[PDB]
């Protein structure tokens, strides 16, 4: 992903969960936050409540959706996947991939990792990993001062 390209095709084929948007759904006037997390890896805990704060904080200033991201038989659980999402009060559009389509799609390589986009529809900022994941809220709010 160089911070420049559109964002990828949205691959992801298990379903969508707790609500239902696209890129070309949501994007016109406000900037975009896609991130990626799971219900039981060792950094996304630190993202799922964070998630959840910057998505009530930001919701009308900021376009939220999400993906989970399985890693692993345990991980597919639809089940969990949307009680942790309850649990956590994740509430935005979240993506399931089936395993890694959009991943592949766009070449991550991490779990816990985020992807911040201008109002027109291509990418500013990404990161992966940090310090309880504290700093994406500064880059979210760097992209939504720096936005008009």
Not at 61 to 71: D, E, F, G, I, Y
Not at 108 to 124: I, M, S, W
Request: glycine share 6%; hydrophobic share 35%.
């Amino acid at each position: 992903m160089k911070l420049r390209q559109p964002m990828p095709e949205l691959t992801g084929e298990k379903a969508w969960l707790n609500g239902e948007v696209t890129r070309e759904q949501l994007i016109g006037e406000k900037p975009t936050l896609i991130h990626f997390w799971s219900i039981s890896c060792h950094l996304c805990k630190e993202a799922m409540p964070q998630v959840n704060e910057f998505r009530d904080k930001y919701q009308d200033q900021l376009n939220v959706v999400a993906v989970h991201m399985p890693r692993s038989e345990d991980d597919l659980d639809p089940g969990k996947i949307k009680e942790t999402a309850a649990e956590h009060d994740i509430t935005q559009p979240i993506f399931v991939d089936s395993d890694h389509a959009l991943t592949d799609a766009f070449e991550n390589e991490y779990v816990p990792a985020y992807y911040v986009f201008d109002k027109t529809g291509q990418l500013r900022h990404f990161q992966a990993g940090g310090s309880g994941m504290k700093m994406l809220e500064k880059r979210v709010n760097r992209v939504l001062a720096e936005t008009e």
